[PDB]
Amino acid sequence: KIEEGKLVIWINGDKGYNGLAEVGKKFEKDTGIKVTVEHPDKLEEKFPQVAATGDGPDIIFWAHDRFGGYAQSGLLAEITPDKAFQDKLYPFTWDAVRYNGKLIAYPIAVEALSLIYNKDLLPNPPKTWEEIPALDKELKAKGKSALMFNLQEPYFTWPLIAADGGYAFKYENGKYDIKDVGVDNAGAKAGLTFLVDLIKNKHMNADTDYSIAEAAFNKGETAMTINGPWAWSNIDTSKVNYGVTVLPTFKGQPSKPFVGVLSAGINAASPNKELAKEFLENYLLTDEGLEAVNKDKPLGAVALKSYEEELAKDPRIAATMENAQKGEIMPNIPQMSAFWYAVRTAVINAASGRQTVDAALAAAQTNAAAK
Amino acid sequence: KIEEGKLVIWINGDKGYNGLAEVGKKFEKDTGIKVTVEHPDKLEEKFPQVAATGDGPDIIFWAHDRFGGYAQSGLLAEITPDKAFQDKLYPFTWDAVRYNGKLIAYPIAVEALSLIYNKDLLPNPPKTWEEIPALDKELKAKGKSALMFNLQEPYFTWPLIAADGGYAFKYENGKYDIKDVGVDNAGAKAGLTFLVDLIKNKHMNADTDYSIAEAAFNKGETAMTINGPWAWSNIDTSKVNYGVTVLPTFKGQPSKPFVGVLSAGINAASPNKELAKEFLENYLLTDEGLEAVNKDKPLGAVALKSYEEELAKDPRIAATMENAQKGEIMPNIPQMSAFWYAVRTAVINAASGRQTVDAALAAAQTNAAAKCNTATCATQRLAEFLRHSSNNFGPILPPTNVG
Numbered sequence A: 001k002i003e004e005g006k007l008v009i010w011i012n013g014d015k016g017y018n019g020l021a022e023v024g025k026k027f028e029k030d031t032g033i034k035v036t037v038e039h040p041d042k043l044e045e046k047f048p049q050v051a052a053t054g055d056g057p058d059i060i061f062w063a064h065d066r067f068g069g070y071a072q073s074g075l076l077a078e079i080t081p082d083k084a085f086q087d088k089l090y091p092f093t094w095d096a097v098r099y100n101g102k103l104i105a106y107p108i109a110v111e112a113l114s115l116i117y118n119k120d121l122l123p124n125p126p127k128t129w130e131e132i133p134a135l136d137k138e139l140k141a142k143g144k145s146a147l148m149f150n151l152q153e154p155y156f157t158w159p160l161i162a163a164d165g166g167y168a169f170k171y172e173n174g175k176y177d178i179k180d181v182g183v184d185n186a187g188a189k190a191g192l193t194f195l196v197d198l199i200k201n202k203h204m205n206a207d208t209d210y211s212i213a214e215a216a217f218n219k220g221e222t223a224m225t226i227n228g229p230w231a232w233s234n235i236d237t238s239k240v241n242y243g244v245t246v247l248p249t250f251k252g253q254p255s256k257p258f259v260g261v262l263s264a265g266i267n268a269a270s271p272n273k274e275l276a277k278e279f280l281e282n283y284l285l286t287d288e289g290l291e292a293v294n295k296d297k298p299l300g301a302v303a304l305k306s307y308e309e310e311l312a313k314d315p316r317i318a319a320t321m322e323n324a325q326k327g328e329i330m331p332n333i334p335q336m337s338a339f340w341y342a343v344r345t346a347v348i349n350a351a352s353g354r355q356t357v358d359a360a361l362a363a364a365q366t367n368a369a370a371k
Numbered sequence B: 001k002i003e004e005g006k007l008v009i010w011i012n013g014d015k016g017y018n019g020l021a022e023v024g025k026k027f028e029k030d031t032g033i034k035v036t037v038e039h040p041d042k043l044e045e046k047f048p049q050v051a052a053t054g055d056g057p058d059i060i061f062w063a064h065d066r067f068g069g070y071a072q073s074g075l076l077a078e079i080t081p082d083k084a085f086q087d088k089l090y091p092f093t094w095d096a097v098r099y100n101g102k103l104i105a106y107p108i109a110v111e112a113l114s115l116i117y118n119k120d121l122l123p124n125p126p127k128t129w130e131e132i133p134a135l136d137k138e139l140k141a142k143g144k145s146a147l148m149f150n151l152q153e154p155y156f157t158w159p160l161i162a163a164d165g166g167y168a169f170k171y172e173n174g175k176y177d178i179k180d181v182g183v184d185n186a187g188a189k190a191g192l193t194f195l196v197d198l199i200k201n202k203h204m205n206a207d208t209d210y211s212i213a214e215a216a217f218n219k220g221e222t223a224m225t226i227n228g229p230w231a232w233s234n235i236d237t238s239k240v241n242y243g244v245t246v247l248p249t250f251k252g253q254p255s256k257p258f259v260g261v262l263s264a265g266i267n268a269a270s271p272n273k274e275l276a277k278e279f280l281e282n283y284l285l286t287d288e289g290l291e292a293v294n295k296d297k298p299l300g301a302v303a304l305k306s307y308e309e310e311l312a313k314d315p316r317i318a319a320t321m322e323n324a325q326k327g328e329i330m331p332n333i334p335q336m337s338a339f340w341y342a343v344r345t346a347v348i349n350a351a352s353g354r355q356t357v358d359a360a361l362a363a364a365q366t367n368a369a370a371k372c373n374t375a376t377c378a379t380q381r382l383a384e385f386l387r388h389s390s391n392n393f394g395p396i397l398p399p400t401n402v403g
Ligand SMILES: OC[C@H]1O[C@H](O[C@H]2[C@H](O)[C@@H](O)[C@@H](O)O[C@@H]2CO)[C@H](O)[C@@H](O)[C@@H]1O
Pocket: A260, A340, B012, B014, B063, B064, B065, B066, B111, B153, B154, B155, B156
């Protein structure tokens, strides 16, 4: 049986299992729990045999595809990494370890075939499969051949077969169910009710608009406001000891703000398309260009890598980045417009007693879904 | 309308439009095309109204959430940035401007609401929403109020609404369709016909297996081969000057290799599930962890963004990761077993001439797509299975190695 207070790990005998023992070691050091790394023969065959009885390793390392049957046989626990951790890994890897919508393993490595060419014999490798016969007829003249690879395993021949539209099984990509809208479920009620309770007790005030908030906070007239980076500069100019922290919790759950990516689109009816492409690529989305905008109003965590690695040292950006990981990125589907529209008049009517919280959110559901 | 040889730019009123205007200065100093930076009210409702007529700005600035609606209205042009430029921007910011497969804008910055407070008025910031009633009563006497944010835009009120269960549209994760298998469709028949043609024209030999191609390449007999990271070590000690690049395209489209993702799963019967979680997330899936494994034996490309950026660099890994991203993830569904032995027979029969390309792939197709569940169709699949169940069971001597 699996021993509590200790980690046993299985991994194939052709992997860097000694280096893994090193890692399990630094772990045993800092926490005082031994980590043994083993590599049994036929481990892909042995694991489901013993893990069914309650035995086996705590962690097992194998190619992701074999994990589907493991999860089918109830041998793998569902994996619970936060959004902060999932960002660290590539998104397609998380798809390789999803079975029945649940994450069942941590991806480690990525494997794929490549074209390997002889620099001496072929310093300019071909870019199209079509130009290999011509290259071969030429290379055959010097007693050589252009291409030789394993033809007896479909793992090696599939890249060519799959190029023009072959596939094993069709994978339906991710999407938003525009018929499953959640603006009148229990959680949405508790939130909006709480906000409308904050005005039934005079703690807030209904027609408080954007400018009233900026003025009142930048006059030491209120203890806190909620806003994004663009409004930081005017609080510098107001000389106020402002801090930027994580949003408060509601019912022990963090506030989930919608995350926007400021974006620049080129109009389709513009005759000056290339000049706009030149302005954004070579003047704005540059280290010097983004700084020009950022010193007017703070941009946030920019998309350009170079400049972001500099602004990331700002503790308030890392606070903004922290709050972004607690929230969701916004969809870009056309129905986003009807959602914002509906929720807007829901919050207002509920906030001014024009409609009850329940009735306002109820009307918001239909308007977000059918329009 | 919009006139040629200028740029009209619309950004929102609360952004840094003066600083953006100065970027139009430098654009007009060097490129001297006039740049007018505007900021109308209700900017995102105004843009599709005028751009439908052919009016509006040249460039429009907003959060990504509106651009798909603009795109479905036929108002935005497809963004055509080259590969060199795409690597300067974070890959997930591009995701925000992808719509129906195409990019429709340039990502600029990530925006998120935060709680900002008044240190000299409040020492420690609160942690719960349910405790501001106390802070407010404690404060209304001292002179002022606690919270005051914009209640006219739902963008500001939403973080609280979503906290306990509110959401816009439930994200339904992607999955496979076991009814839709494509081993005998036009694309597969095209690529396989091309492969068999190489054999017919004696550019390749249908008997070539793994060990032949490795020797022929590691001895300078053939210019190229197709292999994985596991085979690099043998090419090293062969003293062949080899490079590893992207796979050749066919019919203008990239070759799609199967992608294998080495993964660490936690035993469902483990009593140490968080110890495993702490070990994998905080110790192994770091730069130091993967490097310790990679130094013992190469992982190839890794799934950790931070350590993969450093690993390639190595052009062999950069190509391995690029071919992977262009390829097909191995499906983890039980039907893959049929695909594996049916396609294997399919390719061999076609390259050897026993079956036409069309007929070989059609045979593997019905083996992987059930569809028909009458006894005639089921016993046919039963019969084909019992023959790909090769009966060895005897000892393999010497055993496949380990040490
Ligand atoms: O409130 C609805 C509104 O929310 C978002 O707009 C944000 C925008 O992302 C920020 O850059 C800043 O301007 O604050 C705005 C809220 O007033 C959505 O982007 C927008 O589509 C939506 O209408």
